[PDB]
Design a protein around this ligand. Structure first.
Ligand SMILES: [Mg+2]
Ligand SMILES: [Mg+2]
Lengths: 196, 195, 244, 221, 249, 245, 204, 232, 242
């Protein structure tokens, strides 16, 4: 698993790979690791697929109820829901979740929830198996208030390096862009990022 | 383990139980009766883990006496055996099972027949002309398969039990300090004065 | 709160009687007539089916005679639903006794269990008692053939021949006039059928309006014969009450 | 076992083998592994066969109740969600790995569920022991806009690979096709390539060969 | 805090259960429904009384499918019938299908619903069901059958009967017009006549509901390939079929 | 047709009313006067505390209660029921903040209190609340002032009043709404609330009284709920004492 | 040790033309020490027979429980239970204790009273239904029984040939298992007749 | 009044709770106790009531902590339950937070503990009224608690039969007793004078009087028997 | 006696508490109507704000249950908000457990079953509210389903509820008897809103301003309430009509 979420001027972009493996076997090479918990609040998942999917389902239920009761929730609200779920069930959960959301009040925001349930707000967050390999690179290339195209290129480069070095990551690069215009889905095939 | 033997002849049922209870490296008692009278015509011998034996035996005894007082009737040995096997089967899957193996010797007055039932702590029950629990079977079952006859008398069964006790005392490392022998027949349960 | 609406079903009258027990007994007095007769070679049960219609299917209907097990049967007077609930519980208790002891349950034990359930309903819980009276016909290897009666009060009794339901006093008087300790199963069938035909509220006693059953020895094996409508018609025309 | 599912332009097909193994011994040489959740939503199970059967029966009963309550056609996503939540509630202690396909008012659907509660979607899926051979065939012969017959042949070839090359799978192939416009068609024993050869000797014993001690009639009426 | 742990239906000094009789009264004040058993099928029918023509008739189904071989109709309080049908559908699975792998017979499902209604007449803080049920069914061992269940928890079989407002006239009509050799279509026609006698408003395929427990419909199964499995015998009649059989009358 | 429909809670009279709720409303009408005024960027609460005897310690026995750090609540009627209600509201706000991190919105808190009070009118085993509650505060959407009735009915108000002098207070509130379409200042709202309390005290002029004021404003209280004490309290009380004559 | 391998015992059911057969050994023992040679492992409810191998206490408990359930079934339905319905009941009862199972291997045999079809089925300890037409085996000598049946069996044979085949299979499988033997019983079931025969075999 | 005095769950047409009023009347029948305070100390004086001359005078003052206590008027067991709850609350404060429980917070807790009985069906409101004296970080405090739930902080008050005498005396003597700082004996004498003002045909005896004193540099202390003989 | 106090049967076999809840439904003295468009559904309700101290934006009897389902309530606002919260919770729970949005008729059936439980259990009294759910279901289309305190629920081509419900119902009946169709054959939802408002004006015989109406419109996968400005625009478009 190789997931990340980067905030830029026009909003936020979440990127991930599509490789889910059971040991050394490519179980699924077309996995959508970006899950939508609200209209403009998405999450990248890593770890136990069942645990992450269950947490995402429960968060989506809670956010739909929050929308029906008190209107659109902020990104911090979904982050706190994820945090409470992961912390109060830390003894039976193995999930790392990067929650990225764009609202008109706070522009774009990225929170990360590592194991143990902790929550940390970052301008950009990286996680997953391959994340390690692209730590330094990201720290050497990330910039504040980037444009959409340069942010896409940054995420593409980082995920391509992670895929190339990590055997647990691969497939295609899936990105979801949350901006004032709405939600955009981008897919980048191997021939694009391998040639990089 | 303890010596628990039983034989069913034509006219009675004979049960033999070791007299020795030892805790640690010391033989604590040499005159222990490992039997509980369930009904005036049904006796039960028991052996197993310390504590569980007496508790389970007296529990079964209290239940049998309650049923006898309620209905003014003595339960058949088959019904008592089924009751005990059901209790043990419920026990083994409880939080802490009873580790007690029992021999039920009874005289069915409705059939005028002697009945011997062997039940292990797991809830497995059988009707046998001769039975034992633990290592006693390994020695006594050959002798019973050879000598036992269906039309034997009470004295012949006592002789067979004495032969079994002699073989046990000869080829066993544990000193069980002899056995107590009890006969159940139409006149009730009685204990042999000296064996 | 809800105290004002509490009927207090389990209370004593100033005379020392349970209101709901007497009222359920009255309800049963309006129900059908059930009669059991214990002859030296069997037991017979006969009941009067209240429901009457040309379109009712009497073949598949059994509102008054039910099977507790293979050796015990019951006749019910009163509410059919409460009766079926109690009969299901009785079957369950009988099968529990069988599983525990590998022996058929004695009749008195089952009757006492049902009567204790009824008593518990007339002492705690604040619920209405079952408006049902039971006539138990059974056979065990200790007391042989046995005929018992139970009422919503939770009390049970044993009888040689007894009836519950409607017109209890007149039916009991007729039975006491025509009962003998040496009679057989056929004489008991005749007596029960005559008592039903003489204590019925309908115009005439037809096969559609009644059910019959016999616990016999036909071997060393008892048998429960639940009478089919045609067999009921045949026993009716044989005794003379009806005609072919 | 070897179970596969392949989506085609107007529906979805599933296929499986017919051999249940009690350890290294073939218990049933023709065990149908296709179970019906809804009249138009089927699935194939692998792992603990009793667990697969039980979860499929439970989810099918609850889905029938849901359809009678809502008066609507059952949805494949409903079976997916119910199965996933039930399997997750037991943290994988129910060893059922399912390939669930179906057709509903929303279209054709094909998913796979793992015993721990994980779910994935795709056009071609394979589960079981021989799942690797089948998956190889699926990666070698799959294409977009498959027809009904093409998807049927692809699933049959995947199950054949799982049968011949994997010891856990064998015997015949069962297929179930679910189209958008028609009723689901269940082909039991679609292919029969492992027909047993005739024995060299008939072993009919001469009557009286067995030593009989005592015979008696038992009552059953 | 629920403190209604005492029974609401008690015995009156006259020997009657008041709430049960009141539920029977509410049933008698309900729209007339009827059932007729034939040689090869049973027919259930009722009137789909609409308060306003703005309401859609299909949105109110008085005939409900319990099992593929068992349907039911009612007279009395609609919502109680709906919750009873839901509980019956649930008990048909949780008590018989999830244990024996088959749908329950008619008599057992009727007994379960009767147990539910009896508990309603005895449990604490609950009124009886103000509904009478006509349940038609078919099983392989008892053939075809038609049962009637009352609020008291009693149930009884009927060759043909009716309940509701026009219960007495419909029942008297059915008594004269029923025979043991009646076919399914003849029973349908007789049911149409009886219901027509019990209707005051419009009487067409859009105002009355009718269903039949007859032959198996393999086309209504949804899947093919298993010869052992057969189609459901319950089938609700379309408005066009009802109108065709009415015009033939 | 019938009688005794007013002896049990949650029992509908033939007209369609709940008489126990109206009896609770009668109990709140007997209580002292309490008002709330919504300004531009906050709310102000004021209450009259009847000086039963001069042995009472002044400035004690406070009536206004704080929920979370941004909600103020006052109530007229049976004070213990008001304390029960504010305790339940504090529990609701704590749960909301625990799960969602953001302080509970005023409409959400109002709906919570309303559902609680309404559930207290669904069962004959519980007595309806004997208080009418004026509460509110400032959230991300601005200022909000709510009034909640024993029936479970609650509404958003520009100004609210309840108690013995409520009518007079309500009249004065309307004058404000008539004479200030642009809105009042937080300090001006406090002064006007002091005035309205002094005016509505005339119905309860039998015994002496003590005025208690609190406010929650973005500019003057930084969004938090704070009691008006010290120099501003004396300024508002002098304004009211001058305007009374 | 192994719960299923403490008491031993074997059961085998087979099918022939309008008939079924079910045979079982008579041995009951505690590991090596055989304790009883009168432990039958085939029971009958109505016209459906059920053999049970494995832990003997669980065998007896399941026998009593299924007797209970079939008696209640007969009282409620006013008819005897059919082999398919009883197979589904056994499966559900076995799965009801999935996380605390019964160490048994039930085998159901019979002839449906209405259809007249010979029916046999097998279960594991958690209720998985093995509905094979040829033969069902269970017990400690499951591999020996599998070999004997796969070698000897051929379909559509008369009840006498079926008896000979199943008896030879059971005997030659029990003579290769230390925990089986000590006597054998064979039931031949035809639509309206059930014959029970004891077999003579080596007693070691 | 008539059909509205069956339980605490029913309001009257005028909006009254008659069971609570009957509990207040039960308080009124109880013996008279009076409390007063100064900025340094707080005193609670009480007259215990003997049923007959052979009966003992029921102790009407209860110690809740080393800094707070109360005096009761009415049903003794309800006072016991309330005082035990207050003891547990003070103990919880001192144990969990190393902090003496504030008198105002204890009053709020007693208010809620009384209210939880006056709103739910079943049980009953408490049949006792309490006067709580304490000395915390905010100084001396005196509280009057009624089973309706209304707890009020006062300089001086009294409850019981004919308590209005001592109440009006304390109202008249406010400026005097509110400033008796640095001397406990004079405040005790003032409380004795009040409880004497509220007496009919009775005289304060060494057996009838009970004193409780709290304040700065003084723990909550009870004086019974000869200890009160100095103030007779 | 006490058969008029709890949900038990009277000697006539009638539940008086249910009838009294029906009577209490009209306590708000507000009328509402619902109509189906070609691909939309419109609910109109009388918005009455008597006291000027009220914040008129906080006065509403229409609730946004889910993204697709809207619900207008006739009855007191406490029970209205109770039913609203329960319906929102049920819709969210359905979406979570079954993986798709709760249909309109399904939510109506659930709320009607809850009302039936209230009608058969003594410890709970029925809610004195009549609920009208409206949506554009994917399987059905424009959907209006109404439930009452009796546990009864049914779907309508168009419906009305309130004091003058009879008049509005008769008006809608007349219109649909003239047009002989089961929906308003208009593509745009604004014109359907205008139609509903015009027929409410005709039935009630009174004129409305933009402060007297609440409008809820449900279209495919979105339910939304109209602002006062959009309501005034619709009223101006109506005034310029014939
Ligand atoms: Mg292979
Ligand atoms: Mg051997």
């Amino acid at each position: 698993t190789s997931i990340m979420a980067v905030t830029f001027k026009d909003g936020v972009i979440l990127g991930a790979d599509s490789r889910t493996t059971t040991g050394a076997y490519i179980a699924n090479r077309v996995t959508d690791k970006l899950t939508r918990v609200h209209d403009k609040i998405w999450c990248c998942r890593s770890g136990s697929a069942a645990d992450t999917q269950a947490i995402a389902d429960i968060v989506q239920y809670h956010l739909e109820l929050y929308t029906s009761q008190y209107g659109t929730p902020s990104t911090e609200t979904a982050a706190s829901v994820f945090k409470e779920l992961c912390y109060e069930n830390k003894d039976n959960l193995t999930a790392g979740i990067i929650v990225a959301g764009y609202d008109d009040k706070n522009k774009g925001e990225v929170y990360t929830i590592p194991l143990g349930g902790s929550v940390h707000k970052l301008p950009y967050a990286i996680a997953g198996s391959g994340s390690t390999f692209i730590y330094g690179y990201c720290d050497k290339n990330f910039r504040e208030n980037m444009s959409k195209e340069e942010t896409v290129d940054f995420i593409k480069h980082s995920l391509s390096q992670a895929i190339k070095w990590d055997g647990s990551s691969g497939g295609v690069i899936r990105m979801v862009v949350l901006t004032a215009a709405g939600v955009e889905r981008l897919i980048f095939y191997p021939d694009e990022y391998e040639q990089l | 383990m303890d010596i628990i033997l039983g034989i069913r002849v034509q006219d009675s049922v004979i049960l033999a139980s070791s007299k020795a209870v030892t805790r640690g490296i010391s033989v604590l008692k040499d005159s222990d009766d490992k039997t509980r009278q369930l009904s005036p015509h049904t006796l039960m011998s028991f052996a197993g883990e310390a504590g569980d034996t007496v508790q389970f035996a007296e529990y079964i005894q209290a239940n049998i006496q309650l049923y006898s007082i309620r209905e003014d009737y003595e339960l058949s040995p088959q019904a008592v055996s089924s009751f005990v096997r059901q209790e043990l089967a419920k026990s083994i899957r409880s939080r802490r099972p009873y580790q007690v193996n029992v021999l039920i010797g009874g005289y069915d007055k409705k059939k005028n027949k002697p009945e011997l039932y062997q039940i292990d702590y797991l809830g497995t029950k059988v009707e046998l002309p001769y039975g034992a629990h633990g290592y006693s079977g390994f020695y006594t079952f050959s002798l019973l398969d050879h000598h036992y006859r269906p039309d034997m008398t009470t004295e012949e069964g006592l002789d067979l039990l004495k032969l079994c006790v002699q073989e046990l005392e000869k080829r066993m490392p544990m000193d069980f300090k002899g056995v107590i022998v009890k006969i159940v027949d139409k006149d009730g349960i009685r204990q042999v004065d000296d064996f | 709160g809800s105290r004002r609406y509490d009927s207090r079903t389990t209370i004593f009258s100033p005379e020392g009687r349970l209101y709901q027990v007497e009222y359920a007994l009255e309800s049963i007095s309006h129900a059908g007539t059930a009669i059991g007769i214990m002859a030296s070679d069997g037991i017979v049960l006969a009941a009067e089916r209240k429901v009457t219609s040309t379109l009712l299917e009497q073949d598949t209907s059994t509102e008054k005679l039910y099977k507790l097990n293979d050796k015990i049967a019951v006749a019910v007077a009163g509410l059919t639903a409460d009766a079926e609930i109690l009969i299901n519980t009785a079957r369950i208790h009988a099968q529990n006794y069988l599983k525990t002891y590998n022996e058929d349950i004695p009749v008195e034990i089952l009757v006492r269990r049902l009567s204790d359930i009824k008593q518990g309903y007339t002492q705690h819980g604040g619920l209405r008692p079952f408006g049902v009276s039971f006539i138990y016909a059974g056979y065990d290897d200790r007391y042989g053939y046995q005929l018992y009666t139970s009422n919503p009060s939770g009390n049970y009794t044993g009888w040689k021949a007894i009836s519950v339901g409607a017109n209890t006093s007149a039916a009991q008087t007729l039975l006491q006039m025509d009962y003998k300790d040496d009679m057989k199963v056929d004489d008991a069938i005749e007596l029960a059928l005559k008592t039903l035909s003489k204590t019925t509220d309908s115009s005439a006693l037809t096969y559609d309006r009644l059910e019959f059953a016999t616990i016999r020895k036909g071997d060393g094996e008892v048998y429960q014969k639940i009478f089919k409508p045609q067999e009921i018609k045949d026993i009716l025309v044989k005794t003379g009450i009806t005609k072919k | 076992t070897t179970i596969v599912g392949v989506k085609f332009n107007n529906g979805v097909v599933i296929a499986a083998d017919t051999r249940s193994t009690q350890g290294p011994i073939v218990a049933d040489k023709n065990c149908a592994k296709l179970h019906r959740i809804s009249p138009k939503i089927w699935c194939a199970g692998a792992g603990t066969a009793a667990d697969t059967e039980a979860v499929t029966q439970l989810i099918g009963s609850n889905i029938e109740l849901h359809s009678l309550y809502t008066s609507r056609e059952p949805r494949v996503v409903s079976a997916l969600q119910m199965l996933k939540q039930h399997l997750f509630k037991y943290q994988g202690h129910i060893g059922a790995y399912l390939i669930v396909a179906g057709v509903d008012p929303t279209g054709s659907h094909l998913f796979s569920i793992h015993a721990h509660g994980s779910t994935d979607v795709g056009y071609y899926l394979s589960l079981g022991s021989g799942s690797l051979a089948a998956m190889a065939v699926l990666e070698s012969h799959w294409k977009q806009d498959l027809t009904k017959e093409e998807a049927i042949k692809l699933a049959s070839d995947a199950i054949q690979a799982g049968i011949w090359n994997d010891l856990g799978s064998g015997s015949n192939v069962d297929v179930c096709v679910m189209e958008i416009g028609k009723d689901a068609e269940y082909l039991r024993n679609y292919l029969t390539p492992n027909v047993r050869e005739e024995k060299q000797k008939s072993y009919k014993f001469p009557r009286g060969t067995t030593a009989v001690l005592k015979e008696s009639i038992v009552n059953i009426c | 805090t629920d403190r209604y742990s005492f029974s609401l239906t008690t015995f009156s000094p006259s020997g009657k259960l008041g709430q049960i009789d009141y539920a029977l009264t509410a049933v008698k004040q309900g729209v007339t429904s009827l059932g007729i058993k034939a040689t090869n099928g049973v027919v259930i029918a009722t009137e789909k009384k609409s308060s306003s023509p703005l309401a859609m008739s299909e949105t109110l189904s008085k005939v409900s499918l319990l099992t593929p071989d068992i349907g039911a109709v009612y007279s009395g309080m609609g919502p109680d019938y709906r919750v009873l049908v839901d509980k019956s559908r649930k008990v048909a699975h949780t008590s018989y299908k999830r244990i024996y792998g088959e749908y329950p017979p008619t008599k057992l499902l009727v007994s379960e619903v009767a147990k539910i209604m009896q508990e309603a007449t005895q449990s604490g803080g609950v009124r009886p069901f103000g509904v009478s049920l006509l349940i038609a069914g078919h099983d392989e061992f008892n053939g075809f059958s038609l049962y009637q269940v009352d609020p008291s928890g009693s149930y009884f079989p009927w060759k043909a009967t009716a309940i509701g407002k026009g219960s007495v006239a419909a029942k008297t009509f059915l008594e004269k017009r029923w025979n043991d050799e009646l076919e399914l279509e003849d029973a349908i026609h007789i049911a149409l006549l009886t219901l027509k006698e019990s209707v005051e408003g419009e009487f067409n395929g859009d105002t009355i509901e009718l269903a039949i427990i007859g032959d198996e419909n393999p086309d209504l199964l949804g899947y093919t390939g298993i010869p052992t499995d057969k189609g459901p015998r319950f089938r609700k009649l379309t408005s066009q079929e009802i109108n065709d059989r009415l015009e033939a009358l | 047709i019938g009688t005794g429909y007013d002896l049990s809670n949650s029992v509908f009279s033939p007209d369609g009313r709940n008489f126990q709720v109206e009896y609770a409303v009668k109990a709140v009408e007997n209580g002292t006067t309490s008002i709330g005024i919504k300004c531009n960027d906050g709310v102000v609460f004021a209450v009259e505390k009847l000086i039963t005897s001069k042995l009472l310690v002044p400035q004690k026995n406070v009536k206004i209660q704080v929920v979370d750090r941004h909600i103020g609540c006052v109530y007229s009627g049976l004070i213990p029921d008001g304390r029960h209600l504010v305790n339940r509201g504090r529990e609701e706000a704590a749960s909301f903040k625990k799960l969602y991190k953001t302080p509970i919105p005023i409409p959400a808190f109002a709906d919570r209190l309303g559902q609680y009070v309404q559930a207290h009118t669904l069962y004959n085993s519980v007595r309806p609340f004997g208080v009418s509650t004026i509460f509110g505060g400032v959230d991300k959407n601005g200022a909000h002032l709510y009034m909640l009735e024993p029936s479970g009915s609650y509404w958003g108000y520009k100004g609210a009043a309840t108690g013995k002098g409520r009518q007079s207070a309500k009249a004065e509130l309307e004058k404000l709404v008539d004479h200030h379409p642009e809105g009042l200042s937080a300090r001006e709202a406090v002064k006007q609330a002091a005035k309205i309390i002094y005016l509505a005290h005339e119905d309860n002029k039998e015994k002496d009284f003590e005025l208690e004021i609190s406010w929650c404003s973005l500019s003057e209280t930084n969004g938090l709920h704070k009691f008006v004490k010290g120099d501003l309290l004396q300024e508002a009380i002098d304004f009211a004492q001058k305007e009374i004559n | 040790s192994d719960p299923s391998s403490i008491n031993g015992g074997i059961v085998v059911a087979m099918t022939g033309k309008d008939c079924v057969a079910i045979a079982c050994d008579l041995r009951l023992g505690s590991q090596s020490l055989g304790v009883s040679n009168k432990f039958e492992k085939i029971f009958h409810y109505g016209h459906v027979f059920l053999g049970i191998t494995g832990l003997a206490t669980d065998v007896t408990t399941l026998n009593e429980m299924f007797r209970y359930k079939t008696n209640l079934y007969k009282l409620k339905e006013e008819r005897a239970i059919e082999p398919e319905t009883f197979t589904q009941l056994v499966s559900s009862s076995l799965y009801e204790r999935r996380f605390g199972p019964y160490f048994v291997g039930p085998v159901v045999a019979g002839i449906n009273s209405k259809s007249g079809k010979p029916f046999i089925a097998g279960f594991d300890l958690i209720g998985c239904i093995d509905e094979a037409k040829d033969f069902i085996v269970s017990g400690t000598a499951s591999d020996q029984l599998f070999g004997m049946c796969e070698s000897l069996y051929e379909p559509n044979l008369e009840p006498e040939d079926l008896f000979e085949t199943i008896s030879q299979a059971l005997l030659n499988a029990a003579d290769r298992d230390a925990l089986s033997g000590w006597g054998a019983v064979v039931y031949i079931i035809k639509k309206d007749e059930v014959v029970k025969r004891y077999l003579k075999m080596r007693q070691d | 009044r008539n059909n509205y005095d069956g339980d605490t769950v029913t309001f009257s047409p005028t909006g009254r709770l008659f069971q609570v009023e009957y509990a207040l009347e039960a308080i009124k029948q109880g013996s008279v106790t009076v409390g007063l305070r100064s900025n340094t100390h707080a005193v609670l004086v009480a007259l215990k009531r003997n049923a007959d001359e052979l009966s003992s005078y029921q102790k009407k003052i209860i110690k809740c902590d080393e800094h707070m206590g109360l005096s009761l008027a009415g049903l003794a067991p309800d006072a016991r339950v309330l005082s035990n709850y207050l003891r547990q609350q003070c103990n919880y404060s001192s144990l969990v937070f190393n902090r003496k429980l504030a008198v105002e917070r204890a009053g709020h807790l007693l208010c809620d503990k009384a209210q939880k009985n006056t709103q739910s069906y079943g049980g009953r409101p408490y049949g006792v009224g309490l006067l709580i004296i304490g000395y915390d970080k905010s100084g001396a405090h005196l509280l009057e608690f009624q089973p309706s739930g209304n707890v009020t902080e006062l300089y001086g008050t009294a409850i019981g039969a004919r308590s209005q005498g001592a109440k009006t005396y304390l109202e008249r003597t406010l400026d005097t007793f509110i400033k008796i700082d640095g001397n406990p004996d004079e405040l005790i004498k003032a409380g004795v004078e009040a409880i004497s003002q509220s007496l009919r045909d009775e005289s304060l005896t060494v057996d009838n009087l009970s004193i409780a004193i709290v304040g700065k540099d003084t723990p909550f202390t009870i004086y019974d028997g000869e200890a009160v003989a100095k103030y007779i | 006696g006490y058969d008029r106090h709890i949900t038990i049967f009277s000697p006539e076999g009638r539940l008086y508490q249910v009838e009294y809840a029906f009577k209490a439904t009209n306590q708000t003295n507000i009328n509402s109507l619902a109509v189906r468009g070609k691909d939309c559904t419109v609910v109109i309700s009388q918005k009455k704000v008597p006291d000027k101290l009220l914040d008129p934006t906080t006065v509403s009897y229409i609730f946004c249950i889910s993204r697709t389902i809207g619900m207008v309530v006739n009855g007191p606002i406490p029970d209205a908000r109770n039913a609203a919260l329960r319906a929102k919770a049920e819709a969210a729970e359905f979406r979570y457990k079954y993986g798709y949005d709760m249909p309109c008729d399904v939510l109506a059936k659930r709320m009607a079953n809850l009302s039936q439980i209230y009608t058969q259990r003594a410890y709970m009294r029925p809610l004195g509210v009549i609920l009208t759910f409206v949506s554009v279901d994917e399987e059905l289309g424009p959907s209006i389903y109404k439930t009452d305190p009796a546990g009864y629920y049914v779907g309508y081509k168009a419906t009305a509820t309130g004091p003058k419900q009879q008049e509005i119902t008769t008006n809608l009946e007349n219109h649909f008897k003239k047009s002989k169709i089961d929906h308003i054959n208009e593509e745009s939802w604004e014109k359907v809103v205008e139609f509903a408002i015009t027929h409410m004006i005709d039935a009630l015989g009174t004129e409305f301003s933009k402060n007297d109406l609440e409008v809820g419109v449900a279209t495919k996968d979105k339910f939304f309430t109209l602002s006062a400005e959009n309501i005034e625009e619709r009223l101006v478009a109506i005034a310029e009509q014939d």
